[model samples]
Target chain A: PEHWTDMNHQLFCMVQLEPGQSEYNTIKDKFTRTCSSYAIEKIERIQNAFLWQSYQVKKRQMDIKNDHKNNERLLFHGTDADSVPYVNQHGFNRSCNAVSYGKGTYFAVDASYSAKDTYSKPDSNGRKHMYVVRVLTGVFTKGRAGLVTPPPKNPHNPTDLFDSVTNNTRSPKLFVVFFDNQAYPEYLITFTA
Target chain B: LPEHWTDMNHQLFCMVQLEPGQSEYNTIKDKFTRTCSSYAIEKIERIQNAFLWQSYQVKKRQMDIKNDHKNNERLLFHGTDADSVPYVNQHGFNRSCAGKNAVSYGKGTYFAVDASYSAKDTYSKPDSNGRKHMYVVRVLTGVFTKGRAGLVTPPPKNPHNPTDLFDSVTNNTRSPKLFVVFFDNQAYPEYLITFTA
Candidate 1:
C-alpha cells in the first residue's frame, strides 16, 4: 500500500503467510541475495574488461592511423620522382586510381585538359595556359543503382553529366590532374583506354 | 696480510695518525667538500647543453640515416626480424647519410638479418652464401667528433662466402663506432661512443 500509486487505484489486499512458509522465504531470500551480488560483480568485471579492451583497440587504431598519416606525409613532402614514381606520374589522381585498381575496381576517364599558365594570371595569347583535367569513376554500384544516369554526350564539359548522375544521392568518386607546363616530354598523358 | 687487505705507505699512515686537533678533521672535511662540489659540477657538466647538444647532434645524424632511408622509399625488408639487415642500398645510404662531411662508402653496413616470418629475405638469390646477413656500417665525420666512427667491427660476412668485404675499413683504431639516435625520422644531436671494452 505504501509503494502503490493512486493511478493504479485498484483495491489491494495484504496476506499473512503461515508458519510453514519459512522454507520458501529462506530460499527466496538466499536466491535474491546471490543473484543480485552475482549480477553486480559480473557487470563490474565485464565493464572493466570492456574498458581495457576498448582502450587497446582505440590505441591500436590510433597508431595505425598515425602510421598512415606519416606515410601520406612522406609521400607528399619527401623525395622527388625517383622515390615515388607512381605518385609523380599519375599525380594524386593516378595514385588513387591505382589504389582503386588494386581493390579490383575500374575507374573511367571522363575528360581531361591542360594549361601552362599560373592560376593567378589571366588567360592571354602571350601567357602560357594552365591545364586542369577531371576524371569520373563509379563506386560499387550495380543493377538498378547503376541506372542513375547515362554518360555525358560531349566529352569537354563533364559537370552536367556528373550532376545528372549524382542529383539526389551520393556523388561518384572523381579524379583530377593538373599540369603547369609541357617541359617534361617523358610525362605520359594517356589513361587506361 | 688478510686476503682483502693491501699494504699502504707506512710513512703516510704514521703522519695521518700523528695529526692532532681539528686540523686533520678540517682537512678531511675540506677535501670531502671539494670532492663533492667537483663531482656535482662534473655531473651537471655532463648533462649540460653543450654535452647534450653533442649527443643530440649524433642522434640527429643517425636519425637522418633512418629518415633518408624512409625518404628513399627503401622497403624495411624485415619488420620484426632481429637479424634482418636494416641497411639500405647505395642510393638509400647516399640519401640518408647526412652531416657536412659525411663520408660516402661503397657499401652500406648491415645490422641484423634473420629468416623469420617477419624477417625479409636478406639475399636476392637463394644460394648458400646469399644476402641472408645483416650489417652495421658507420658513417664517420670529423665535424662532429674527430675520426671516430668505426668502433665495432662488422659481423662476419656470409659464412658460406669467403671473398665478401665484411670487415672492410681503412682504419679501426682511430674511428669511433657510429651510432644513430633517432626520434622518428628526425635525428637527435647526440653521439655516443662506448670505448669501454
Candidate 2:
C-alpha cells in the first residue's frame, strides 16, 4: 500500500476456452488488461453510434402485445402493430423489421422476461431455457449508464443511447434499457438485432 | 427464438489497423479508421435516412482481396461472384452484367463499377505490407436505380450497341447508399486469418 504506482488495475478482457473440445483455430491465450482496458473496449462503438441515432424511433412507434399487466412481449411482427405496446411502452414494433434496420439499437432484458423459464426441460448442466440469437453485440461493464448495462427500467421512455463516453474511464457503448428478462440489471448487458 | 439458441445466427467479422494518411484512410470517415476498438465492420443494412455518399466499397461479402505480396498485380475484382451484378455503359445506360452468378438485382440491389482503377488510380493498388491489404480499397456504392422512377422502357442514351444493345436498364433505385461500418472492442476480428486470397 505504500506505493500506489505499483497497483495494476485489472479486468478480464475476455477469452475463449473449450479444453478437450477446443478446435485448433479457436484455441488461444486468455486476453486481459488493466481497468482502463474497459474504455479501450468500446471506443469504436461510440464513433458510429451517431449514425444509428439517425434511425432512433419514438417509444410509441414500436410494436408489442399484452402478455399481462406490467408485461408485454416485444413482438417483432405478427402482433397488432396498431395496438399500443403493452404497458411496457417502447419495444420493437415488428420482427427484425423497422426496429433495428439501422438505428444500431441496443436491447436489455432481466429474468423478469425469460429466466429459469424452464429448468425442468433443462440442459445437461441442469440449467433452464437459454436465450440465444443469430447476431448479438455489446459488452459487460461495472457502473450505471456504464455503456453496456441493461434495460431502462422505464415503461415508456427513450433510454440513453451512447454518443461517447468522454472519459477513458468509461467503457462499452449504448447499453440495454429496461429489458425485463434478466434477474439482475447487474448483469450489465448489451445485445443486437 | 422461441426456445434457447434455436434460431440461426450470422456474424460479420472485421479488423482495423492503420496509420496516419493511408489512402483508403482519407476516403472512409472515422467509423472504420479508429484503432484499438473491439467491434469492426459488422452490420451492413440500409438504415435509410440521409441523403447519400457517392463512395466506393470493398464489397465485404466478396472474397478477400489479396495483393499476394506482389504489389503490381492486385486482384481488383472479387465481388462475391455476386448472385446479381449490374453494369453501366462506359457510355451511359443502365444495364445488367450477366453470366456467372445469374441473379437479377431487384428494384434495389447495391452496385457500382469498381472505380478504384478508374479515373484515378489515386488509391488503387498495393498500399500495405502485411495482411492488411483489404483495408486499402475504396469503391462507390448506391441502391440499384437501373430504370427511371416511372420505369422507362428505353435507356437514357440513344443508339447503343447490340451483340451490344447500346441501351438497357436492369435493376436500379434512387435510394441513398448508406456507407457505414462498425469498430467495436478488441471483440474485433481478433479471430482473423491472413492467408493469401
Candidate 3:
C-alpha cells in the first residue's frame, strides 16, 4: 500500500490507452517499478475514489429526481428532519452537519440522506481502494469516435474531472461533461449508480 | 463571495409555507429535529433568488463561451485574430480543429491536379451535377445538458481510409477553434446571377 504521493495522485488522472497503445507503455515505463504492487495499489485507490464520486453524483441525482417525482418540493420540506436524508453532488450527506461546512463524509445512496463520505473519507465505510490492475488503466482513459484516442487534451489540465485535479467537493461540484456511454466507457463506470 | 456558492449551498428554498400539522407539515418539522441531527432551519439568502436568475445567465454565458458547436464560427477566414479556442472539453477540439474540433472537409496542401478543381477528396462531395461549390449552414454552439467535455477525437490523418474527413481538406487543418458547417461539397451551383448595375 502506497501513501497517496504526488506521483500516485498525478498518475491517477492521466489519459492513457488500453494496454495496446504505446503511450500507455511510456507512462508505465515512467512509473516503472511502482507497478509492482506498490503503485498498482495506489491506482486502485484512485479508481475507488472515482467510483465513489460516481456513486455520489448519481445518488445526488436520484434524490433530486426524487424531489422532482414528488413534484418539485410540493410535498417536500427542507425544514423537517424526517423529510428524507439524501446524497449530494459533492458526495456528502445533505442532512449532515458537515454538509453546511461543505465537507462530505461516508455514504452510499442506500442511505436515507442519513450520511456519506466516499470522496473525503472512504476508510470509514471500509470500501475504498486503489487498483485491481484488471481495469485501472482502461477505466481512467480511452474513449470515442474519430480515433481510438480521445482527441487531444489541453496542454494544461489534461484529464478532466475523472481525477480530482483541483480539490473541490467535485462529486457535487461538477463541470457537466459527457460520461458519454456511446462514445466512452465513463458512462458505465461513472454512472452505474 | 456568494456567487461562488451553488444553490445546493443555500438553505432549502421553500415553495410552500404550511405550518407544522403534526405528521404532515410539522411532522416533517419533527423529523427535521429528530434523528438527533437537527440543525437550524435557515432560509436561502433572499439575494440568492435575485442572482439565481443571474446564475442562469452566468451559466448560459459560460456555456456559450465553451459551446464548441454553437460557438463554432469559422476560425480560418477570421485570420490570426480568431479566438484562441476556449479550453473546455479535454480533447481540445477547440485547441486545433485540424487536430481536434475540425469537422470533415479540410486540410491537405495535399495538392490539386491540372485536370480540374477538386475539393471532393478533402470532403467536398459532388453536387447532383458532379461539381463542388461552397454554401452556408448555421452553426449552433455547444451541446447542452453535458457535451463530451473531454478530449476530442480528431479526424483520421489520412484522406483515403474513409474518416480523415475534415482533416482531408485542401487548406489542411484550417485553424484551431473553428468549426465550419458546410454543404459537404454538393450543396452548391447557385443559379443565374443578380447583378445590381
Candidate 4:
C-alpha cells in the first residue's frame, strides 16, 4: 500500500491452490456438473490490490446508498490466456459489445457455459482458462440489443436506470454489467477440454 | 477556406463544408447516388473534433495491432433524428443513444452499408422543414461475426479460442448490409449529409 513499485508487483499476483482445497473443489464441482470432458489442472486465487480496491469502493458505495442493493454473486467468465493478464490488471472491459445482451462485459452463472471454447479458448499447449468473479448485479432487467444502459426504472423517469442486464428474467443464463468496477476477478481456473 | 461549424451552438465540433465541385463531395455524392438519390444534394460537411478523432485513432491502432495491421475500415451510414445531430456531432456516435432504431443484431451502434437504408423514415426522421440528415461514419469492422438479438459480444471466432474475439457484428455474415460496433470509438461520424425527400 505504501510503495508504488510493490503495488505494481502485487497487481496481478496469483496464489496457488492445493488439490482438494475447499475453493478448488468448489470450482471443480461447478465445472464438472455441466461439463464432463475438461480436466481442471490448477486453480489460482487472484489478488490484485488495485482491482480489489475498486471493487470494495463500489460495494461499499452501493451498500450504503441503496441499502445493501448489491446483488453480489460469484460468476464465471471464459477468456483466452492472453486476456487474463488484462483482466487481472484492469478488470473487464465493458466497452466491448455482445450482440445477445448489450455492450457490456458478460458473465455466466454456470461454469460450463463459460467453459465453452467459444469463450475460454485453449492456449498454445491446449490449456483453457476461466475466471470465477464477484459480480454486483444489483437490480437487473431483461437485456436487448443496442442497450447502452439498463432501461429506466419507470416509463416517465429517464434518470433512474436499471443496475444491470440479463439474458432472461426468470431463467437467466447470462448477466451483463456496464461498469468495469461491477466485477472483481476472484479466482482463475486452468483446465484442458 | 475557413472551417465552419455545423451548428454554431456547439462549436466544439468543426463541420467543414465540402462544395459540390470538391473531390470529397463528389465521392460521397457518387456513393449516395449509387444506392438511391431521391433527394437533391444540399451540402456535405466533414465532421471533425480533437477528442472524437483521438478516440477513433486509438481504436484504429488497437485493431491494427490485433489484426496485424489488416484492420478493416469502411465508410458506413448512420441515420439519426434531427434533434440528435448536435449531440452526435459533439460526442460522436454512442451506443447509449442507439436504441432509437431497432437493434436486430446486438446492442451497439448500428451502421448501414447502403445509403438508402439510412435514408429511411424509421432512421432519418424528417425535420419541420422536411429535411433529413444522415452520417457517413468511418467504421472499423475488422474481424466480424454474425450477431444475434441478445448477443452481448461477438462469439469467439474459433469455438476453442476466446482470445481472438470478433471485432464487430453484422446482420448477415455473407453479405452484411448492417454493422454493429460495441465501442463508441470504433466509429467516427466522418461526414453529415442533409437532404430533402
lDDT of 3 by residue, B1-197 (tens): 23433454444221222333423344333432342132233211111222223222333343344343364322121111112112211122221232222333332111121101122223333334443221111122223111122313323334454322231122223332233321111111111100010
Between candidates 1 and 3, the one scoring higher on DockQ is 3
Best by lDDT: 4
Candidate 2, which CAPRI tier? incorrect
Better of 3 and 4 by DockQ: 4
Candidate 4 contains a number of clashing pairs equal to: 18
**Docking category for candidate 4?**
incorrect
lDDT of 2 by residue, B1-197 (tens): 11311123331111233333654333332333242133233222211111111001111111122212222112111121111111110001111221211333332212223322111222112224311111212222211124433321222233432111112233333442211111110000111111121
What DockQ results for candidate 3?
0.04
lDDT of 4 by residue, B1-197 (tens): 12443554533347788888878899999998888667776778988765566556656765676588674898999888888887688657766567734658877788999999998889889999898899999999998988987755666788776644688899888999999886556788889999886
- How many pairs of residues collide in model 3? 45
Q: Name model 1 segments beyond 4 Å from true.
A: A1-193, B1-103, B106-156, B159-197
iRMS of candidate 1, Å: 21.1
DockQ of 4: 0.08
